[PDB]
Amino acid sequence: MQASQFSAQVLDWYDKYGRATLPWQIDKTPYKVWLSEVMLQQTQVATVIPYFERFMARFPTVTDLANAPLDEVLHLWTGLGYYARARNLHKAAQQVATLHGGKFPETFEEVAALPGVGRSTAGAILSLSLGKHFPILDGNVKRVLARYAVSGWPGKKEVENKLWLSEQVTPAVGVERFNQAMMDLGAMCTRSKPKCLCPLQNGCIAAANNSWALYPGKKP
Numbered sequence: 104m105q106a107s108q109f110s111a112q113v114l115d116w117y118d119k120y121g122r123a124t125l126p127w128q129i130d131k132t133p134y135k136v137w138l139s140e141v142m143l144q145q146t147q148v149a150t151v152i153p154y155f156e157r158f159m160a161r162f163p164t165v166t167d168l169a170n171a172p173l174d175e176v177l178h179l180w181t182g183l184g185y186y187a188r189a190r191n192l193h194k195a196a197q198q199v200a201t202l203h204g205g206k207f208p209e210t211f212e213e214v215a216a217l218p219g220v221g222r223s224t225a226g227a228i229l230s231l232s233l234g235k236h237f238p239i240l241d242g243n244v245k246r247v248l249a250r251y252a253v254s255g256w257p258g259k260k261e262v263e264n265k266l267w268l269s270e271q272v273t274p275a276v277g278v279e280r281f282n283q284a285m286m287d288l289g290a291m292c293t294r295s296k297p298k299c300l301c302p303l304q305n306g307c308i309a310a311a312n313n314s315w316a317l318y319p320g321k322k323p
């Protein structure tokens with residue numbers, strides 16, 4: 104499907120079903136988006152909501168998080184699992200306080216340099232909070248794009264580079280809505296039995312061939 108049509112269809116879909124009412128989607132700031140992305144990396148949205156609210160109440164700013172004892176951060180994280188995220192979260196907060204005077208960085212390199220934040224997460228933080236022109240590529244997005252019929256295992260460098268398709272379909276105008284739409288689409292284009300309610304159904308190769316099971320490829 105033509106890139107221009109891909110982004111246009113996803114944006115039109117988001118405008119009608121794009122439920123952007125979650126806490127981290129209102130009065131967005133790099134800090135709030137970063138915090139939510141880290142919590143959402145390996146935890147379901149329903150579970151994350153109360154923690155996000157608790158964290159924002161206890162740590163209104165990144166400096167408050169940086170100055171808090173690690174033990175307190177880990178205690179509040181209890182129940183989210185995958186604590187390496189919490190440890191990196193605290194280190195990143197301290198890096199922001201130390202290197203950026205407490206102002207969460209708004210430039211890609213400085214964001215990506217934070218512990219626990221990669222190319223995709225950095226792109227998400229800046230695109231969603233400031234509308235900066237960056238594409239994303241998490242598990243949800245890989246699924247949607249792979250189902251352009253990319254059958255290789257994303258674990259392979261060449262396949263990962265191929266998927267990073269994301270750049271081609273991601274627009275600058277409306278990037279915040281498009282990136283959120285892609286994540287919503289992949290989360291609600293599911294692993295099993297996708298609900299091809301999808302704005303890409305008229306051009307998706309997997310849908311046309313009823314072959315979604317082949318994309319993305321599984322670890323060989």
Ligand SMILES: Nc1ncnc2[nH]cnc12
Nearest residue numbers: 143144148283286287290
């Ligand atoms: N923006 C987002 N909305 C819902 N689930 C997500 N998982 C990762 N990012 C997400």
Ligand code: SF4
Nearest residue numbers: 292299301304307310
């Ligand atoms: S049409 Fe179906 S398989 Fe294709 S992107 Fe949409 S949900 Fe996924």
